[PDB]
């Protein structure tokens, strides 16, 4: 029974990094041969597992997280990293077991005059914990004066748009990201390779 990897990698709409999507992948045959055959991906980094021996490993559970960030922020989708993304949007644990796959999506996520659909959380009171999600739109009180839901001096909106332009260099173009989390519990495996 094939795992629905196409439903994640080949999805039509991708999430904004702050409101990142998650698909639980269970009770299926994970053929990573379809992802290894695809020349679209410019990043394939594994942690706690080998990419060559992925078609041999068995897991209790798999989680596929997907979202869009700028190319220069792809380095932030790794354990122990800092930045606006790792700190306020999507955090990986230090003890991470899984792979991080990214690919340039300038052909789909850029627009003439800029695409402003994609957002990222720019401000937050504290850093996110591994796999924490924050989709709140409450006004950030950067100063001492209370905002009371209104924007003003030191009272900023927490989300900021990326504005993907087709004129940008490779590092400033949008990238579609999939993060695979591998759960290896002391219980029977539901996901195995071929």
């Amino acid at each position, epitope marked *: 029974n094939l795992c629905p990897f196409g439903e994640v990698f080949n999805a*039509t*709409r991708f999430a904004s990094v702050y409101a990142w999507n998650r698909k639980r992948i269970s009770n299926c045959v994970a053929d990573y041969s379809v992802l290894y055959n695809s020349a679209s991906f410019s990043t394939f980094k594994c942690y706690g597992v080998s990419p060559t021996k992925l078609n041999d490993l068995c897991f209790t559970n798999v989680y596929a997280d997907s979202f869009v960030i700028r190319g220069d922020e792809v380095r932030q989708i790794a354990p122990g990293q800092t930045g606006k993304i790792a700190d306020y949007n999507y955090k990986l644990p230090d003890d991470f077991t899984g792979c991080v796959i990214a690919w340039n999506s*300038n*052909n*789909l*996520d*850029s*627009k*003439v*005059g*800029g*695409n*402003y*659909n994609y957002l990222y959380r720019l401000f937050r009171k504290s850093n996110l914990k591994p796999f924490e999600r924050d989709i709140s739109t409450e006004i950030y009180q950067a100063g001492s004066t209370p905002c009371n839901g209104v924007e003003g001096f030191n009272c900023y909106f927490p989300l900021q748009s990326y504005g993907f*332009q*087709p*004129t*940008n*260099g*490779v590092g400033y173009q949008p990238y579609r990201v999939v993060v695979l989390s591998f759960e290896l519990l002391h219980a029977p495996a539901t996901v195995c390779g071929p």
Partner: antibody
Amino acid sequence: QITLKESGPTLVKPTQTLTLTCTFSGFSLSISGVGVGWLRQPPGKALEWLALIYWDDDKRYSPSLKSRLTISKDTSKNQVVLKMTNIDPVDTATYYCAHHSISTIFDHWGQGTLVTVSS
Amino acid sequence: SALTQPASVSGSPGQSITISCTATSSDVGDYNYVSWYQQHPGKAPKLMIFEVSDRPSGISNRFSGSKSGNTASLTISGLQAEDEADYYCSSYTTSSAVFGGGTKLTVLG
């Protein structure tokens, strides 16, 4: 096959509003990364982009003509309409509508419609 | 205006010709999306090359694209009479889809 066709008046007087329609087929203006553009070519002159509308209704215009341009889509009728207010003699041109993707800029152009502006 | 092309280029059958497209400003950024259009009289523009050097399906391999800095080039090898047409380059600025002024190509008969 992806096809686009322009329709509208062949003669308009200055100060009036020119309304052109683009009837397309062979593709959906709902799929991500797809758009439809309106361009023009004055006789013996270069191609010039006027407006563009994306699958998500995000609209882009030529900054120098933005105040007079209005683009819209009708997903049900397969039409993309361009309205140009305060028409002037320099607006006499063949008007084209074309399929847009970031990668190609514009492909599958329509045959065009020569619009004459005269009082 | 944002892109500059020679007004005209000419060659004889069997030869190779090159049409340039120089970006006049920084507004094109990385200048990665460069398309070339062939336009015959009274006809609609036809996409010959996109993304500097990619060829749409059905376009002869005699047409090729390349770029050196801010100058993109369309090369046509084995020049044939039917190649005589207007050629336009196109790209993006931070606000618009722009075009060069066009180049009338003459194949001497």
